[PDB]
Amino acid sequence: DSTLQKARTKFLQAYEGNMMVRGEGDDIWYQRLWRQLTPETMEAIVEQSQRFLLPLFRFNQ
Amino acid sequence: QAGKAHSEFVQPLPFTLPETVPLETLQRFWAHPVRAFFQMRLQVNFRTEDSEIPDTEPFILEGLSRYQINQQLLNALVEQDDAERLFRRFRAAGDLPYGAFGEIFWETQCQEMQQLADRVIACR
Amino acid sequence: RRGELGFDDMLSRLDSALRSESGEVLAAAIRTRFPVAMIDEFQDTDPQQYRIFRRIWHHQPETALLLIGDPKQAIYAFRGADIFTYMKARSEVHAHYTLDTNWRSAPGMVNSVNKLFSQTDDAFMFREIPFIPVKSAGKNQALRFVFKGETQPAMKMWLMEGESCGVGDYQSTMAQVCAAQIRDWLQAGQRGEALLMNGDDARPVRASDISVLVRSRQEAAQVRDALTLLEIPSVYLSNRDSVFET
Amino acid sequence: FEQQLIEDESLLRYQACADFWRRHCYPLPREIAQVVFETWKGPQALLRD
Amino acid sequence: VTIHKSKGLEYPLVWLPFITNFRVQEQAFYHDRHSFEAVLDLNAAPESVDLAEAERLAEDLRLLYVALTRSVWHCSLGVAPLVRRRGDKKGDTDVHQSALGRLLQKGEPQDAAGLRTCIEALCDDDIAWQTAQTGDNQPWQVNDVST
Amino acid sequence: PTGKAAARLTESLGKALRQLPLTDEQKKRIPEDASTLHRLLGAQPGSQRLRHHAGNPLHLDVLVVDEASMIDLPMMSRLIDALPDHARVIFLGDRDQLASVEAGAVLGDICAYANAGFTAERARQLSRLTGTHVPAGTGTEAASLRDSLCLLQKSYRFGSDSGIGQLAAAINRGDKTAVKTVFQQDFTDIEKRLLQSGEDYIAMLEEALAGYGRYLDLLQARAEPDLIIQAFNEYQLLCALREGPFGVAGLNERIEQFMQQKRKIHRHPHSRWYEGRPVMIARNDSALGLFNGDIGIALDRGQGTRVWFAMPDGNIKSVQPSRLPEHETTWAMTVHKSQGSEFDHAALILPSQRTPVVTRELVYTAVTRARRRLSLYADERILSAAIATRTERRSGLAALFSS
DNA sequence: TTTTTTTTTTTTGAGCGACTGCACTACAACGTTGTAGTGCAGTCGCTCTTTTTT
C-alpha cells in the first residue's frame, strides 16, 4: 500500500506540478480529451504505461 | 433542459498500416502520442499566438534563450573552441546582460558546460 | 509630470496641507464645514488619517469625535493598517464605551468564545487591547444544532492523534476528516436527522450551511480536492482568478 | 481642480526600480558587482524585497 | 471563504481545519513600544526579530478571534501537534508558537500529551473534543427531480 | 523555383516517362514528385534557418533543377551549400530568358560562355560518344564550364517558317532586324497595330473582343466550363505596369466597363461575383491544388456562382468564391507573372511612358509567350529603344571565371 | 518597376535542513582492541498567505 500511495503521489506531482514548475497536465492536447483527471482514465494511463514504458526501466543501467 | 449532452471525442477510426513507415514518423509519434494523434490523423494543430515584445532589456537568462545559449556553448566546448569568441558573438547581439553581469553569467555557464564536456569528450 | 494621483496621495496631500501654517485655518474651515465626526472602522486607520483627525478635532469646543471601531478585528496589517495607531488613539482619548450584547450567535458559542479567550490575562499580549466577556441575546438562546443522537455541542476541537506530524499529511488528514463530517452532515441531513432548531422550529442542514474557513489558496484547493472526491460540489468565494486565463 | 486617478501603481514602481538599477548597478566594477549579484539577481528581487 | 473575506458575514456551521498552522516572520520590521513608529532594522538583531514575532503572534490571535466569532450554531476546530521545526521527534512541539496553542497551553511549551491534557481540561457543555477518524463509506445520493 | 513550374514539370515528366518502355525495377525508380527550392531545403516562415543548410546534406543521387533562369544568387548559394560531394546536378532553363527576381543573374552569366564552344579534347570525346561530327570551340578560357554547357538552337514546335522563332532570333540582334522581320509579309504570325490615341485604344478593345470571341460565345451558350477555360486559354493580353491607363488594373477596369457597355457580360454592381469574370491567385495553396499564376473562371453551373479551375491533370475543379485566398482580375497579365504559362494567341500592350521594365528581355519573353499568333500595340520609338537597351547586371562572375 | 515562398519543438527550483552511512581519532578495557563522538559525503522532504480604495 505504501508504494501504491507513493506512485499516486508521483503521478499527481508529475501531472499537475507546483506553482513554479509547469506540470504535464497543463497542456492544450490533454485538456481537449478530459477536463478533470478521472481515476478511470488515470488507471487506463497507468495500464498503458505499464504495457509500453516497461522496457525503459527494465534495461536501464 | 431537453438537450443532448456532449459525447466523447474518442471514436474508433478505420486505419490501415502502410508498408513503408519511416523512423521519423515513429519518433514524432513516440515524442507525443496524443499530439501525433491530433495533428497528423485529423490534422488539427492548435496554433497559439506568438509572444509579445518585452518592455526592457534582458537582465537574466531563463527559458528558451538560456537553453539555446547552453546548447551553443556545449556544441562549442565539445570541439575545444574559443569560448571568448562566442562570448563576444553573443554580446554583440545584445542577448547578454550589459557589463559585468553578462560576464558572470557567461562564466558560470562556461563552468557548467566545461563540467559536462569533461564527461562528454572523455568517451567520444 | 503626468499629473496623476493615487489613493494614498490624497491622504499625503491633505497631511501636507494641514502640516503648513495657513492650513490650520483651513482646518477651522473644516470646523466651519462639519462640526462633528463619526469615524467607523477605526481599526483600519492609517497614521496619516489619525494625524489629520487630530489636527482638526483634537480639543476644539462644540466639535465631537466618535471613533467607533474594534481592536480585535484589525486583520488588515498587510494592507497598511496598524494597531499601534489605535493604541496611540486609545492613550490619547479619555473616555471608553463598549457594547455588551451580542445578537448573532448562539449562547453556547458565545460562552465558548468567552471561555477560550479568558484563560489567561491579556490574551492578545498587549496592555491596551483588553478582552471583555460578551453577553448573548435573549431572543437567540434557543438555537440548537441537533444531531440524530442528541444535541451537538457548540465547539468540537477535532484533535488529530499522534506525536509529531508534518504539514502536508496533517492538512490531508484534516481535509479528509472535514469532508467526512460534511458528508455525514449532508447524508443525515436529507433524512431529517441533523437539524437546526430555533425553539420548536426546525430546519434541515443543506450544503450552503456548512462553510470551511481557510487562510491560504493551497489549503483551499486541498479542501476542494478532498471534498470533490466524495461527490460534494463546493464553491470558492475568494476566487479572484481572471476569466481570460481559462 | 481636475486630476486623473490611476488604479494600478505597480508599473511606475517597477519602472522607477529599473531606473535605479540602471543608474546604480551598471557602472560598478567586477569586485562590487559580484557582491551585488550575490545579494540580488536583478532589480526584480530588490523590488520584491 | 478566507478569514479576511469572512469579516462581517454570517455562517451557520463553520469548520476550521487549518487553524493551528502558523508561519514565522523572518524580516525585522516592527513598531516601537514608546514612540509607536515603524522601525525597520536592516541588521539581524534578535530584539527586532522578537518584537516583529510578537506583532505577528498578535495578528494571528486577531485572525483566530475573527475566524472563531463567525459561527452561529456550531464551529469545529482542527488541532494537531504541528512541528514547524525540521526535527521529527525532538520531544517538544511548536503549538505554543501558534495562536491556538497559546490559549490552549496558556502560552507554555508542552508535548502532545500535555496538549491533550490542556484540551481535556477545558471541557464544558459547549466545548468537546473527538479524535480524527479516517474513513469513507459512500460519497452521496443525487436525488434529482424533474423539470 | 515556383509551384506552378513544379506542377508543369510533374505533369510533363509523368506524360513523358510512361511513353518510354521500362522494367519492374525501372518503374520503381521513377521520380515521384518535383519540389520547390524553398521546400527541398526546408525553409521556415519565421526563421531563415534551413534543415539541410551546412551540416547534413540532402540524401540525393541526381538533382534536376528546372527553370534555372528564375534562380537568384542567394537561392543558388543556398542550394550549393546543401549539396554533398557526390550529387550530380542538371540545370534547365533558357539563356536569353528573363532575369532573376532578386539581385543577381546566375544562369545568364553561366551560359554566356556557351557561345565559345567546347574543348578540343571534349569535341573528340563527344564525337566518340554520339558517333557524329561535333564541332570544336576556338580557344580555351575555362574548359570545365565550357564543357559542362550546351546550347539548344533547333526548336521543334516552331521552325524558320514561323515568324515567332524569327522574331525571337531578331530580338537578340538589332532593332532594325526586328523591324524587317515584322515588316515583310508578317510571316502570317505577327501583326503590328499602332497605339497612340483613344481611337487606337477603342480599336485595341475591339480586337480583344475579336480575340475573346470564342470565350464569350461559349460563355453565353451555357456550355461546359472545360471548353470555356480551353477557349479562354487561347487569347491573352500582356501588359507591363499594374495601375494607370497602361497596366493590369487599368486594362481590367476598362475591359469590365466595355463588357458593361456592349451586351457581352451582365454585371451586378454590388455582387462582385458576376458570371464570367476571370480571376487569378496571388499566393500558393497546396490544400486546394491551385498555385500562383493559375487562372479560374467564375460561372453558374446550376448550384450557384462557383469558380472553375483547370487542373494540369486534365480535370476541372469547382471551388467556392469564399474559398479563394486571393483573387485578381486577369484580363491582362504582366510579363513577369506570366512566365511558365503558354498561350496560343498573345497580344502585347506597351505603355507610351518610358520605363526600364520594357527592355530586350521583356519583349523576348512576350514573343516566346505566344504559341502561334502574336499581336503588338506599341510605338516604333519604344520598340526601337527596348531592343537596344539590354538589362545588363554588373557582376564579378566575368572576372572570376576568367582566371 | 517587376516579382519568389515557408510550416518543426526545445526549457524550466534551489537553498535549508534532516537521514543515513563511512571514516577517523579519544579513551578506557583487555601493545592491542571495542565503543563513542565528530566530521564528510550522498540522498531526500520542502517550500514560496490574506485585498480594496474615484
Side-chain angles (χ1 to χ4, degrees), chain C residues 73-74 104-106 109 125 153-161 164 170 183 187 211 213 230 238, chain E residues 2 7 9 13 15 17 31 54 62 71-72 74-75 77 79 88 116 126 128 130-131 137-139:
Chain C
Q73 288 184 351
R104 184 194 305 271
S105 300
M109 224 287 299
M125 85 184 300
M155 197 173 70
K156 196 176 188 183
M157 296 178 295
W158 289 88
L159 176 59
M160 201 270 297
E161 197 68 32
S164 180
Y170 146 78
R183 75 167 179 88
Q187 185 180 325
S211 61
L213 259 59
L230 305 182
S238 304
Chain E
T2 51
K7 185 177 181 180
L9 292 186
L13 311 181
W15 237 97
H31 301 276
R62 284 170 276 164
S71 57
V72 178
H74 179 69
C75 56
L77 289 178
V79 201
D88 299 0
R116 188 173 183 177
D126 310 331
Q130 264 188 6
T131 173
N137 306 330
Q138 49 181 343

CSV table of all heavy atoms in Angstrom, one decimal, chain C residues 73-74 104-106 109 125 153-161 164 170 183 187 211 213 230 238, chain E residues 2 7 9 13 15 17 31 54 62 71-72 74-75 77 79 88 116 126 128 130-131 137-139:
chain,number,residue,atom,x,y,z
C,73,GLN,N,-10.4,43.1,15.6
C,73,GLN,CA,-10.7,42.8,14.2
C,73,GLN,C,-9.7,43.4,13.3
C,73,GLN,O,-9.9,43.4,12.1
C,73,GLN,CB,-12.1,43.2,13.8
C,73,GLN,CG,-13.2,42.4,14.5
C,73,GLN,CD,-14.6,42.8,14.0
C,73,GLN,OE1,-14.8,43.8,13.3
C,73,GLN,NE2,-15.6,42.0,14.3
C,74,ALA,N,-8.6,44.0,13.8
C,74,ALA,CA,-7.6,44.6,13.0
C,74,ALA,C,-6.8,43.5,12.3
C,74,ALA,O,-5.7,43.1,12.8
C,74,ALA,CB,-6.7,45.6,13.8
C,104,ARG,N,-25.8,37.8,17.3
C,104,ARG,CA,-25.6,37.0,16.1
C,104,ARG,C,-25.6,35.5,16.5
C,104,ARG,O,-26.4,34.7,15.9
C,104,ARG,CB,-24.2,37.3,15.4
C,104,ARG,CG,-24.0,36.5,14.2
C,104,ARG,CD,-22.5,36.6,13.7
C,104,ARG,NE,-22.1,38.0,13.6
C,104,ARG,CZ,-22.2,38.6,12.4
C,104,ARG,NH1,-22.7,38.1,11.4
C,104,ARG,NH2,-21.7,39.9,12.4
C,105,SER,N,-24.8,35.0,17.4
C,105,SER,CA,-24.5,33.6,17.6
C,105,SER,C,-25.4,33.1,18.7
C,105,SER,O,-26.0,33.8,19.5
C,105,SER,CB,-23.0,33.3,17.8
C,105,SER,OG,-22.3,33.8,16.7
C,106,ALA,N,-25.3,31.7,18.9
C,106,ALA,CA,-26.0,31.1,20.0
C,106,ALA,C,-25.2,31.3,21.3
C,106,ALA,O,-24.0,31.6,21.2
C,106,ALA,CB,-26.1,29.6,19.7
C,109,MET,N,-21.9,29.2,21.7
C,109,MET,CA,-20.7,29.7,21.0
C,109,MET,C,-20.2,30.9,21.7
C,109,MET,O,-19.0,31.1,21.8
C,109,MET,CB,-21.1,30.0,19.6
C,109,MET,CG,-20.0,29.5,18.6
C,109,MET,SD,-18.5,30.5,18.6
C,109,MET,CE,-19.1,32.1,18.1
C,125,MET,N,-1.9,39.7,24.3
C,125,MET,CA,-0.5,40.0,24.7
C,125,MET,C,-0.1,41.5,24.7
C,125,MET,O,1.0,41.8,25.0
C,125,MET,CB,0.5,39.3,23.7
C,125,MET,CG,0.9,40.0,22.5
C,125,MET,SD,2.0,39.0,21.4
C,125,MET,CE,3.4,38.8,22.5
C,153,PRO,N,-22.8,19.8,20.8
C,153,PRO,CA,-22.2,21.0,21.4
C,153,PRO,C,-21.8,22.0,20.4
C,153,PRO,O,-21.7,21.7,19.2
C,153,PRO,CB,-21.1,20.4,22.2
C,153,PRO,CG,-20.7,19.1,21.6
C,153,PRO,CD,-22.0,18.5,21.1
C,154,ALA,N,-21.4,23.1,20.9
C,154,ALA,CA,-21.1,24.3,20.1
C,154,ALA,C,-19.7,24.1,19.4
C,154,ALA,O,-19.6,24.1,18.2
C,154,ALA,CB,-21.1,25.6,20.9
C,155,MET,N,-18.6,24.0,20.2
C,155,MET,CA,-17.3,23.9,19.7
C,155,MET,C,-16.8,22.4,19.9
C,155,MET,O,-16.9,21.9,21.0
C,155,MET,CB,-16.3,24.8,20.4
C,155,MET,CG,-15.0,25.1,19.6
C,155,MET,SD,-14.0,26.4,20.3
C,155,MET,CE,-13.5,25.6,21.9
C,156,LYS,N,-16.3,21.8,18.8
C,156,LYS,CA,-15.8,20.5,18.8
C,156,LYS,C,-14.4,20.5,18.2
C,156,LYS,O,-14.2,20.5,17.0
C,156,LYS,CB,-16.7,19.6,17.9
C,156,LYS,CG,-16.5,18.1,18.2
C,156,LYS,CD,-17.6,17.3,17.4
C,156,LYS,CE,-17.5,15.8,17.8
C,156,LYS,NZ,-18.4,15.0,17.0
C,157,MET,N,-13.4,20.5,19.1
C,157,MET,CA,-12.0,20.5,18.7
C,157,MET,C,-11.6,19.1,18.3
C,157,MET,O,-11.3,18.3,19.1
C,157,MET,CB,-11.1,21.1,19.8
C,157,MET,CG,-11.4,22.5,20.2
C,157,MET,SD,-10.4,23.1,21.6
C,157,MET,CE,-11.0,22.0,22.9
C,158,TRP,N,-11.5,18.9,17.0
C,158,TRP,CA,-11.1,17.6,16.5
C,158,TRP,C,-9.5,17.5,16.6
C,158,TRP,O,-8.8,17.9,15.7
C,158,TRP,CB,-11.5,17.4,15.0
C,158,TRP,CG,-13.0,17.2,14.8
C,158,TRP,CD1,-13.9,18.2,14.7
C,158,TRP,CD2,-13.7,16.0,14.8
C,158,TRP,NE1,-15.1,17.7,14.6
C,158,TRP,CE2,-15.0,16.3,14.6
C,158,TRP,CE3,-13.3,14.7,14.9
C,158,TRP,CZ2,-16.0,15.3,14.5
C,158,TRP,CZ3,-14.3,13.7,14.8
C,158,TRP,CH2,-15.6,14.0,14.6
C,159,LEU,N,-9.1,16.8,17.7
C,159,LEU,CA,-7.7,16.7,18.0
C,159,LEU,C,-7.1,15.5,17.1
C,159,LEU,O,-7.5,14.4,17.3
C,159,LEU,CB,-7.4,16.4,19.4
C,159,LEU,CG,-6.0,16.2,19.9
C,159,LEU,CD1,-5.1,17.3,19.4
C,159,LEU,CD2,-5.9,15.9,21.3
C,160,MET,N,-6.2,15.8,16.2
C,160,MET,CA,-5.6,14.8,15.4
C,160,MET,C,-4.6,14.0,16.3
C,160,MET,O,-3.7,14.6,16.9
C,160,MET,CB,-4.9,15.4,14.2
C,160,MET,CG,-4.7,14.4,13.1
C,160,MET,SD,-3.1,13.5,13.2
C,160,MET,CE,-1.9,14.9,13.0
C,161,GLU,N,-4.7,12.7,16.3
C,161,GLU,CA,-3.9,11.9,17.2
C,161,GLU,C,-2.6,11.6,16.7
C,161,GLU,O,-2.4,11.3,15.5
C,161,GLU,CB,-4.7,10.6,17.5
C,161,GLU,CG,-4.2,9.8,18.8
C,161,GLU,CD,-4.5,10.6,20.1
C,161,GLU,OE1,-5.5,11.3,20.1
C,161,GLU,OE2,-3.7,10.5,21.0
C,164,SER,N,4.1,13.5,16.5
C,164,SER,CA,4.5,14.6,15.6
C,164,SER,C,4.1,14.3,14.2
C,164,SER,O,4.3,13.2,13.7
C,164,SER,CB,6.0,14.8,15.8
C,164,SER,OG,6.5,15.9,14.9
C,170,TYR,N,-0.8,16.4,7.7
C,170,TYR,CA,-1.8,16.9,8.7
C,170,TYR,C,-2.9,17.6,7.9
C,170,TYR,O,-4.1,17.5,8.2
C,170,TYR,CB,-1.1,17.9,9.7
C,170,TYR,CG,-1.9,19.1,10.1
C,170,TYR,CD1,-2.9,18.9,11.0
C,170,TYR,CD2,-1.7,20.3,9.6
C,170,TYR,CE1,-3.7,20.0,11.4
C,170,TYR,CE2,-2.5,21.4,9.9
C,170,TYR,CZ,-3.5,21.2,10.9
C,170,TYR,OH,-4.3,22.3,11.3
C,183,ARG,N,-20.0,15.1,4.7
C,183,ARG,CA,-20.8,14.1,4.1
C,183,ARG,C,-21.7,13.4,5.1
C,183,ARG,O,-22.8,12.9,4.8
C,183,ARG,CB,-20.0,13.0,3.3
C,183,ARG,CG,-19.2,12.1,4.2
C,183,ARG,CD,-18.7,10.9,3.5
C,183,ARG,NE,-18.0,10.0,4.3
C,183,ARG,CZ,-18.5,9.0,5.0
C,183,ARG,NH1,-19.8,8.7,4.9
C,183,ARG,NH2,-17.8,8.2,5.7
C,187,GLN,N,-25.6,13.6,4.6
C,187,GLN,CA,-26.3,12.3,4.4
C,187,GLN,C,-27.4,12.1,5.4
C,187,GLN,O,-28.5,11.7,5.1
C,187,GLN,CB,-25.3,11.1,4.5
C,187,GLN,CG,-25.9,9.8,4.2
C,187,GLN,CD,-24.9,8.7,4.3
C,187,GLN,OE1,-23.7,8.8,3.9
C,187,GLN,NE2,-25.3,7.5,4.7
C,211,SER,N,-19.6,25.8,6.1
C,211,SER,CA,-18.6,26.6,5.4
C,211,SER,C,-17.3,26.3,6.0
C,211,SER,O,-17.1,26.2,7.3
C,211,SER,CB,-18.9,28.1,5.5
C,211,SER,OG,-19.0,28.5,6.9
C,213,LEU,N,-13.5,27.5,6.7
C,213,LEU,CA,-12.7,28.8,6.8
C,213,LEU,C,-11.2,28.4,6.7
C,213,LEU,O,-10.7,27.8,7.6
C,213,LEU,CB,-13.0,29.5,8.1
C,213,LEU,CG,-14.0,30.7,8.0
C,213,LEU,CD1,-15.3,30.2,7.5
C,213,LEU,CD2,-14.2,31.3,9.4
C,230,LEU,N,-15.6,13.1,-2.7
C,230,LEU,CA,-16.8,12.4,-2.2
C,230,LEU,C,-18.1,12.9,-2.8
C,230,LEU,O,-19.2,12.9,-2.2
C,230,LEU,CB,-16.9,12.7,-0.7
C,230,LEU,CG,-15.6,12.2,0.1
C,230,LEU,CD1,-15.8,12.4,1.6
C,230,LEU,CD2,-15.3,10.8,-0.2
C,238,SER,N,-13.4,33.2,-2.4
C,238,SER,CA,-12.3,34.1,-2.5
C,238,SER,C,-11.5,33.9,-3.8
C,238,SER,O,-10.4,34.3,-3.9
C,238,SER,CB,-11.3,33.8,-1.3
C,238,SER,OG,-12.0,34.0,-0.1
E,2,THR,N,-12.0,32.7,2.9
E,2,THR,CA,-10.8,33.0,3.7
E,2,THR,C,-11.3,33.8,4.9
E,2,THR,O,-12.4,34.3,5.0
E,2,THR,CB,-9.8,33.8,2.9
E,2,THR,OG1,-10.5,34.9,2.2
E,2,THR,CG2,-9.1,32.9,1.9
E,7,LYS,N,-15.1,38.6,7.2
E,7,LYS,CA,-15.3,39.6,8.2
E,7,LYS,C,-16.6,40.3,8.0
E,7,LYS,O,-16.8,40.9,7.0
E,7,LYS,CB,-14.1,40.7,8.2
E,7,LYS,CG,-14.2,41.7,9.3
E,7,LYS,CD,-13.0,42.7,9.2
E,7,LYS,CE,-13.1,43.7,10.3
E,7,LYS,NZ,-11.9,44.6,10.3
E,9,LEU,N,-19.6,38.7,7.8
E,9,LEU,CA,-20.5,37.8,7.2
E,9,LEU,C,-21.2,36.9,8.3
E,9,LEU,O,-21.0,37.2,9.5
E,9,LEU,CB,-19.8,36.9,6.2
E,9,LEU,CG,-19.4,37.7,4.9
E,9,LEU,CD1,-18.8,36.7,3.9
E,9,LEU,CD2,-20.5,38.5,4.4
E,13,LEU,N,-22.7,26.8,10.2
E,13,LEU,CA,-21.8,25.9,10.7
E,13,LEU,C,-20.4,26.2,10.1
E,13,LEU,O,-20.3,26.4,8.8
E,13,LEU,CB,-22.2,24.4,10.3
E,13,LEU,CG,-23.6,24.0,10.7
E,13,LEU,CD1,-23.9,22.6,10.3
E,13,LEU,CD2,-23.9,24.3,12.2
E,15,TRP,N,-16.2,25.2,9.8
E,15,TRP,CA,-15.2,24.2,10.0
E,15,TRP,C,-13.8,24.9,9.8
E,15,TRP,O,-13.6,25.5,8.7
E,15,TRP,CB,-15.3,23.0,9.1
E,15,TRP,CG,-15.4,21.7,9.8
E,15,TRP,CD1,-16.6,21.0,10.1
E,15,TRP,CD2,-14.3,20.9,10.2
E,15,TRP,NE1,-16.2,19.9,10.7
E,15,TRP,CE2,-14.9,19.7,10.8
E,15,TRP,CE3,-12.9,21.0,10.2
E,15,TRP,CZ2,-14.1,18.7,11.4
E,15,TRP,CZ3,-12.2,20.0,10.7
E,15,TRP,CH2,-12.7,18.9,11.3
E,17,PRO,N,-10.1,23.7,9.6
E,17,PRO,CA,-9.2,22.6,9.6
E,17,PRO,C,-7.8,23.0,9.8
E,17,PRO,O,-7.0,22.2,10.4
E,17,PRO,CB,-9.4,22.0,8.2
E,17,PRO,CG,-9.8,23.1,7.4
E,17,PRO,CD,-10.6,24.0,8.3
E,31,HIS,N,7.3,47.8,15.4
E,31,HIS,CA,6.9,49.2,15.9
E,31,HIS,C,7.5,49.4,17.3
E,31,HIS,O,7.5,48.4,18.1
E,31,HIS,CB,5.4,49.3,15.9
E,31,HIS,CG,4.8,49.2,14.5
E,31,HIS,ND1,4.7,50.2,13.6
E,31,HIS,CD2,4.2,48.1,13.9
E,31,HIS,CE1,4.1,49.8,12.5
E,31,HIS,NE2,3.8,48.5,12.7
E,54,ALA,N,6.3,39.1,18.0
E,54,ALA,CA,5.2,39.4,18.9
E,54,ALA,C,4.0,40.0,18.2
E,54,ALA,O,2.9,39.7,18.4
E,54,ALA,CB,5.7,40.3,20.0
E,62,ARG,N,-5.6,37.8,16.5
E,62,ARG,CA,-6.7,38.6,16.0
E,62,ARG,C,-7.4,37.8,14.8
E,62,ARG,O,-8.6,37.8,14.7
E,62,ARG,CB,-6.3,39.9,15.5
E,62,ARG,CG,-6.0,40.9,16.7
E,62,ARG,CD,-5.3,42.2,16.2
E,62,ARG,NE,-3.9,42.0,16.0
E,62,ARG,CZ,-3.1,42.8,15.4
E,62,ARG,NH1,-3.6,43.9,14.7
E,62,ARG,NH2,-1.8,42.6,15.3
E,71,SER,N,-19.1,31.8,13.5
E,71,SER,CA,-20.1,30.8,13.6
E,71,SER,C,-21.3,31.2,14.5
E,71,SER,O,-21.2,32.0,15.4
E,71,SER,CB,-19.4,29.5,14.2
E,71,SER,OG,-18.9,29.8,15.5
E,72,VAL,N,-22.4,30.7,14.1
E,72,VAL,CA,-23.7,31.0,14.8
E,72,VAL,C,-24.1,29.8,15.6
E,72,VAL,O,-24.3,29.9,16.8
E,72,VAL,CB,-24.8,31.3,13.8
E,72,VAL,CG1,-26.1,31.6,14.5
E,72,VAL,CG2,-24.4,32.6,13.0
E,74,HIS,N,-22.6,26.1,15.2
E,74,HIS,CA,-21.6,25.2,15.6
E,74,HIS,C,-20.3,25.5,14.8
E,74,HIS,O,-20.3,25.9,13.6
E,74,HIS,CB,-22.0,23.7,15.2
E,74,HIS,CG,-21.0,22.7,15.5
E,74,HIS,ND1,-20.6,22.3,16.8
E,74,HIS,CD2,-20.2,21.9,14.7
E,74,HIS,CE1,-19.7,21.4,16.7
E,74,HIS,NE2,-19.4,21.1,15.4
E,75,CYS,N,-19.2,25.4,15.6
E,75,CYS,CA,-17.8,25.5,15.0
E,75,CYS,C,-17.0,24.3,15.4
E,75,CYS,O,-17.1,23.8,16.5
E,75,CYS,CB,-17.1,26.8,15.5
E,75,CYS,SG,-17.0,27.0,17.3
E,77,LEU,N,-13.0,22.7,15.2
E,77,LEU,CA,-11.6,23.1,15.1
E,77,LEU,C,-10.7,21.8,14.8
E,77,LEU,O,-11.0,20.7,15.3
E,77,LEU,CB,-11.1,23.7,16.4
E,77,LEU,CG,-11.6,25.1,16.7
E,77,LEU,CD1,-11.1,25.6,18.1
E,77,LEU,CD2,-11.3,26.1,15.6
E,79,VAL,N,-7.2,20.5,15.7
E,79,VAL,CA,-6.0,20.6,16.5
E,79,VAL,C,-5.1,19.4,16.2
E,79,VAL,O,-5.5,18.3,16.0
E,79,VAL,CB,-6.4,20.7,18.0
E,79,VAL,CG1,-5.3,21.3,18.8
E,79,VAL,CG2,-7.7,21.4,18.2
E,88,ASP,N,11.9,15.6,13.5
E,88,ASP,CA,10.7,14.9,13.6
E,88,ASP,C,10.3,14.6,15.0
E,88,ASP,O,9.2,15.0,15.5
E,88,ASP,CB,10.8,13.5,12.8
E,88,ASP,CG,11.1,13.8,11.3
E,88,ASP,OD1,11.2,14.9,10.9
E,88,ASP,OD2,11.2,12.8,10.6
E,116,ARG,N,-3.0,17.4,24.9
E,116,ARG,CA,-4.2,16.6,25.1
E,116,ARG,C,-4.8,16.9,26.5
E,116,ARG,O,-6.1,17.0,26.6
E,116,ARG,CB,-4.0,15.1,24.9
E,116,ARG,CG,-5.3,14.3,24.9
E,116,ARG,CD,-5.0,12.8,24.5
E,116,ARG,NE,-6.2,12.0,24.4
E,116,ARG,CZ,-6.2,10.8,24.0
E,116,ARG,NH1,-5.1,10.1,23.7
E,116,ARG,NH2,-7.3,10.1,24.0
E,126,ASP,N,-20.5,23.2,26.1
E,126,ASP,CA,-20.4,23.7,24.8
E,126,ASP,C,-19.1,23.3,24.1
E,126,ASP,O,-19.0,23.3,22.8
E,126,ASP,CB,-20.4,25.3,24.8
E,126,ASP,CG,-21.6,25.8,25.6
E,126,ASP,OD1,-22.6,25.1,25.7
E,126,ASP,OD2,-21.5,26.9,26.3
E,128,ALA,N,-16.3,20.4,23.4
E,128,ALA,CA,-16.0,19.0,23.5
E,128,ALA,C,-14.9,18.7,22.5
E,128,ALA,O,-14.5,19.5,21.7
E,128,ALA,CB,-17.2,18.1,23.2
E,130,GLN,N,-13.0,15.3,20.0
E,130,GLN,CA,-13.0,13.9,19.5
E,130,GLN,C,-11.8,13.7,18.6
E,130,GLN,O,-11.2,14.6,18.1
E,130,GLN,CB,-14.3,13.6,18.7
E,130,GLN,CG,-15.4,13.0,19.5
E,130,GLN,CD,-16.6,12.5,18.7
E,130,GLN,OE1,-16.5,12.7,17.4
E,130,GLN,NE2,-17.6,12.1,19.3
E,131,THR,N,-11.4,12.4,18.5
E,131,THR,CA,-10.3,12.0,17.7
E,131,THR,C,-10.7,12.0,16.2
E,131,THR,O,-11.8,11.9,15.8
E,131,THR,CB,-9.8,10.6,18.1
E,131,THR,OG1,-8.8,10.2,17.1
E,131,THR,CG2,-10.9,9.6,18.0
E,137,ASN,N,-17.5,5.8,3.5
E,137,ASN,CA,-18.4,4.8,3.2
E,137,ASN,C,-19.0,4.9,1.8
E,137,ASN,O,-18.9,4.0,1.0
E,137,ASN,CB,-19.5,4.7,4.3
E,137,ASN,CG,-18.9,4.5,5.7
E,137,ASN,OD1,-17.8,4.0,5.9
E,137,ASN,ND2,-19.7,5.0,6.7
E,138,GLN,N,-19.7,6.1,1.6
E,138,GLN,CA,-20.2,6.3,0.3
E,138,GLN,C,-20.2,7.8,0.0
E,138,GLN,O,-20.4,8.6,1.0
E,138,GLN,CB,-21.7,5.8,0.1
E,138,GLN,CG,-22.6,6.2,1.3
E,138,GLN,CD,-24.0,5.6,1.2
E,138,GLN,OE1,-24.4,5.2,0.1
E,138,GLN,NE2,-24.7,5.6,2.3
E,139,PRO,N,-20.0,8.3,-1.2
E,139,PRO,CA,-19.9,9.7,-1.5
E,139,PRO,C,-21.2,10.5,-1.2
E,139,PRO,O,-21.2,11.4,-0.3
E,139,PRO,CB,-19.6,9.8,-3.0
E,139,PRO,CG,-18.9,8.5,-3.3
E,139,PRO,CD,-19.6,7.5,-2.4
